[PDB]
């Protein structure tokens, strides 16, 4: 007859276009900024006396950008670890130098991988 | 001496929203329950109690 309620994926979504009876397929996706680990779909099948899903719910996992670039003759303000999505790193130039460019860069996600946004600034003497 | 014909149902209790507590206090406690009759309560047909007995005199 019908498969049990699909449930919910933390930081994800379950699409149920065709009900949850035998033969139905449901689809999984992660929210932007999260990557899917596991299956992306499940089929409702009959196995012996049980009506059950073919595949379990996947995991949606976040992400840290790598250590920020150093700039010549400047300093990263308050450098630390674990720069997650949307966090930013700001720079200042050393005494004797003037900055040109964006003073801050942000951790973004590209293809499931954490990458720093725009180009870091330059310090000129 | 209740039977199914004169059944009265049950009472059950559930957490409506868990027990929350600050640090430094016991994480478990006790709830006590008291019973009493309301003012529309009455009883009829006197009989002996099942609860008391004896095997011989000098009781």
């Amino acid at each position: 007859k019908s498969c049990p309620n699909p449930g919910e994926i933390r930081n994800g979504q379950i699409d149920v276009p065709g009900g949850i009876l035998f033969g139905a397929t449901i689809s999984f996706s992660c929210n932007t900024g999260y990557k899917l680990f596991g299956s992306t779909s499940s089929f409702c099948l009959i196995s012996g006396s049980s009506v059950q899903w073919s595949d379990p719910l996947p995991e949606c996992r976040e992400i840290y950008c790598p250590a920020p670039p150093q700039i010549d003759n400047g300093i990263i303000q308050g450098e630390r670890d674990h720069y997650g999505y949307r966090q930013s790193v700001t720079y200042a130039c050393n005494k004797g130098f003037t900055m040109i460019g964006e003073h801050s860069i942000y951790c973004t996600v590209n293809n499931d991988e954490g990458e720093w946004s725009g180009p870091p600034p330059e310090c000129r003497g | 001496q209740q039977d199914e014909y004169t059944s009265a149902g049950n009472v059950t209790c559930w957490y409506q929203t868990g027990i929350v507590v600050p640090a430094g206090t016991p994480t478990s406690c006790s709830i006590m329950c008291f019973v009493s009759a309301c003012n529309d309560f009455s009883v009829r047909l006197l009989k002996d109690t099942p609860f008391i007995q004896q095997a011989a005199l000098l009781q």
């Binding site: 309620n5 699909p6 919910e8 933390r10 930081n11 994800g12 979504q13 379950i14 699409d15 149920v16 276009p17 689809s27 999984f28 996706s29 992660c30 929210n31 932007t32 900024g33 999260y34 976040e62 999505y85 | 957490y15 409506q16 929203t17 868990g18 027990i19 929350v20 507590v21 600050p22 640090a23 430094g24 206090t25 016991p26 994480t27």
Partner: protein, 252 residues
């Protein structure tokens, strides 16, 4: 004190020893449909007590990082006793509600929840050029969860709390009827919502009259406070339920 308060509907009663006030719709208490506002001509059924009473939904756990939760409304009570049965058997229905959100903690805990009833909370899709699912919208009792980041997936609601699934500033949800549950001062929220729609009655399966959202704005926190478990419970009671257009029951 005025923190103390009791409410009785049908065979059910709620109590609090730490209430704020009680918010009432847009100042309007529920009423039954008047003859000069009606179109459906058949005699209504007004189950009264069998239907207008407190139903408690399954509780949720407030975690140090919970983004929030929501429930769609006439749907969500669809399996609640006779209120639900009357829904299945009638084409048209109309009701108001007393919503009572409960959450107690301790004088050593802290956190703050916004509790809002949003009329007509049409939600947006995660997949920008796709469309939602009824599943992405509501799961009956239980509750959909907001998310801390942008979501993907076809059919699911774009649920980053920050935009409340509607494309607005979450911090502006206050033009809607609401109360806050600030753990240091308060342990429950009570909102009475009147029927709000652009027609006198409507079908209760096809249209979510309003959405209840519980969004923590200041997160749960505590110390060696051997109480990490802090649940939130929603109890709601239909008021002045009336139904029209009786026929066979709707297909689940």
């Amino acid at each position: 004190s005025d923190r103390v308060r009791s409410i009785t509907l049908g065979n059910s009663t709620i109590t609090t020893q730490e209430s704020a006030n009680v918010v009432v719709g847009y100042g309007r208490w529920p009423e039954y449909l008047r003859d000069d506002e009606a179109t459906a001509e058949d005699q209504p059924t007004q189950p009264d007590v069998a239907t207008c009473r407190f139903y408690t939904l399954e509780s949720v756990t407030w975690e140090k990082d919970s983004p929030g939760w929501w429930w769609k409304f006439p749907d969500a009570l669809k399996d609640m006793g006779l209120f639900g049965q009357n829904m299945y058997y009638h084409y048209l229905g109309r009701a108001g509600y007393t919503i009572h959100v409960q959450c107690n903690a301790s004088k050593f805990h802290q956190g703050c929840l916004l509790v809002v009833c949003v009329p007509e909370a049409e939600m947006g899709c995660s997949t920008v050029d796709g469309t939602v699912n009824e599943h992405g919208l509501s799961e009956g009792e239980t509750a959909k969860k907001f998310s801390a980041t942008g979501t993907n997936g076809t059919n699911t609601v774009q649920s980053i709390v920050t935009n409340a699934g509607m494309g607005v500033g979450v911090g502006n949800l206050t033009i809607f009827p609401h109360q806050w549950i600030n753990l240091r001062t308060n342990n429950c929220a009570t909102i009475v919502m009147p029927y709000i729609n652009n027609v006198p009655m409507d079908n209760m399966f096809r249209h979510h009259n309003f959405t209840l959202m519980i969004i923590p704005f200041v997160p749960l926190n505590y110390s060696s406070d051997f109480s990490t478990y802090v649940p939130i419970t929603v109890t709601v009671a239909p008021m002045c339920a009336e139904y029209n257009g009786l026929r066979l029951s709707t297909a689940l």
